[PDB]
Subunit: 80 residues, 10 copies
Amino acid sequence: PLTTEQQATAQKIYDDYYTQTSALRQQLISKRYEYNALLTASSPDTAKINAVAKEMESLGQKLDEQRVKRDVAMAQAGIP
Amino acid sequence: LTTEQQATAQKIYDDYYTQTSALRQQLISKRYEYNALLTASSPDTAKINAVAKEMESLGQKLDEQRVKRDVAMAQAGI
Amino acid sequence: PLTTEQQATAQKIYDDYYTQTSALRQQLISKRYEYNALLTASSPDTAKINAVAKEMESLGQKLDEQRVKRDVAMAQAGIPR
Amino acid sequence: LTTEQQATAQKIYDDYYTQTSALRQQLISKRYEYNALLTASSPDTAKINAVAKEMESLGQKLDEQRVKRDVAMAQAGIP
Amino acid sequence: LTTEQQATAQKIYDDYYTQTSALRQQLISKRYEYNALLTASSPDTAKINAVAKEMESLGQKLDEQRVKRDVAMAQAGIP
Amino acid sequence: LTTEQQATAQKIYDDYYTQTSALRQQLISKRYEYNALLTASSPDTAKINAVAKEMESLGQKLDEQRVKRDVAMAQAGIP
Amino acid sequence: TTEQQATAQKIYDDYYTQTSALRQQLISKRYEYNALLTASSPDTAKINAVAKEMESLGQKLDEQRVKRDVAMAQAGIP
Amino acid sequence: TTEQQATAQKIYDDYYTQTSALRQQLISKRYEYNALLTASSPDTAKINAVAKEMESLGQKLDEQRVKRDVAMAQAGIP
Amino acid sequence: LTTEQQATAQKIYDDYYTQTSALRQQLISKRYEYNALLTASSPDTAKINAVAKEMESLGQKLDEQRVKRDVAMAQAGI
Amino acid sequence: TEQQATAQKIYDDYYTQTSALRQQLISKRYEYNALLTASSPDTAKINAVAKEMESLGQKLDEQRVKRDVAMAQAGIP
């Protein structure tokens, strides 16, 4: 279980994370689609595939920084 | 449940699956684009609608084969 | 991920969609049952099965257009995935 | 569990599924027709009521066999 | 789906559950009885066939009521 | 798990199921019966209570058997 | 019915207060039974003794369960 | 893997084999523990006595689970 | 089952979690740590062992507290 | 199909050229959680581990695309 206070604090932490990361998540989701789109073309274009793969690597690293930032906040706050 | 029939079903399915693998793959590829376009930062409605019309025709061709399959079965008495 | 505001716009876009396609979805279901009836009939009738396949195809084409309007609406409101 | 019982449990069920397959197929077919009608733009109680009768009849004929198998099965001393 | 459609279906089903409490309950009793007989040490065919006929009948009464229900739903325009 | 244990376990369970098949099928026939009775329109305390006593009796004998096999399992060193 | 719901509450309510002690006691003897069956060196006299205690407890409780079941039927509830 | 899948059974078998007796007592001691909690009047001293008995058995099981986890990792298994 | 009881049990359990919170967090941390060591490229037995023990302790303290709760519950008549 | 072979060849190799990576990434992940669940987090140690996790994952995805691409050229769905 969790306290009223703990939940409150955790709710703000996650809300910020979501808000601060919205565009990023949506761009990543959009890029996997494109990735999958390309992999399933009739005649696969390896160049485009790799380019889209690298875009995903870039977005993904940014997104991990935000999560870690959020994890550390949670731990500093003393939450489970 | 019969051997005669059993061999009738798989033959229709395999003909169905073999006569449609390209379309299916193309339909899947196209849903991925559709979703990609929908999730872009500035959705391009013209592009999105064009891709939906492609899906619509691919899917029309598929359903057509699906009805053949279904009707081959009814006729096989299976 | 969705905020109070976003939950509501999405909900409204979906209700609108349900309401507008309501009779169209019912008809589509009715044809799907009829089709299955035909396929399971004691002695199968290809003409009827085919004619019913077409009615379904046309109804489904109308339904999908409505879904595209809906998905596009959603995208235009900035609502995630 | 015993041999002569398994022999009788198979012959009992196999017979039933053979004696039963046309009836189940017709009944399934009408279950669909009945639903197709109940979902028609404007409901037609006559055909709906009619189809419903076709189903009862098919079901009575189907339970009549259900009983028959259950009885054989009990006379054979099986659970 | 719609709140008013949900309210309307609820009344239709409630009316049905009330108009049939006694049949349901009776059919359930005959169901149990039927199995009590089938699992007797010495199964009594005649007695079982008679229970089947009582269930057959309760069953049709029940069905007609279902059709009323289904038609009533179709009539309210509930999916 | 072990081999000489599986044989022993399998043998004990089979005697149990054989020495109790008829008793077990009878208890089932009475649970169905009890329920049929509890579910009639006009309930009959007398028969209900009669059947309850027959189940208490069958169950006593049956539990007596289960303990007989739990001891066997335990005496053989099985989990 | 309204009346229906209430009486059952009392019926079921009477039943629970008339068996809290037995229920608990049988749960305990069943734990004890299993304890003995799983002992390093099983004592079949001890095991049988507990099986007898369970039998009594069970009988007394099944006897209440019928009283309960009879009440309900008499009060016309499923 | 395949050749390493064998190598795992071997390590688990030993673990299962060496811990049978412990595991069974732990199970029995846990049943008495519960039989005691559900006694008509819970006896604190006895309950704590059984609990300490579970500690030990527990510590002895853990102590073998660790030899196992270690045997695995050294076998270089996932 | 009773409201009054429900409240008592909820209260006994609230106490338990509140009081074992830091302890539960330390055990979770150590389990992770332990798994980290197991999956190291070249496993280190001394430190794995060292961690097994640290978990052993925390685990015993945690069990003492589970027993206290079970007894609490026991005497409260729940 | 008659191509389920190539699919395995392409996956097995993916796996073999990856085992050490996946395992080290699992270890680092465990180490990451062990640190977040400490009573008071050491944000320095946590960040260093997140970086270790970040490269491993980047190396691993690179192999995964290689693998996906292969499948695509094998004409395998």
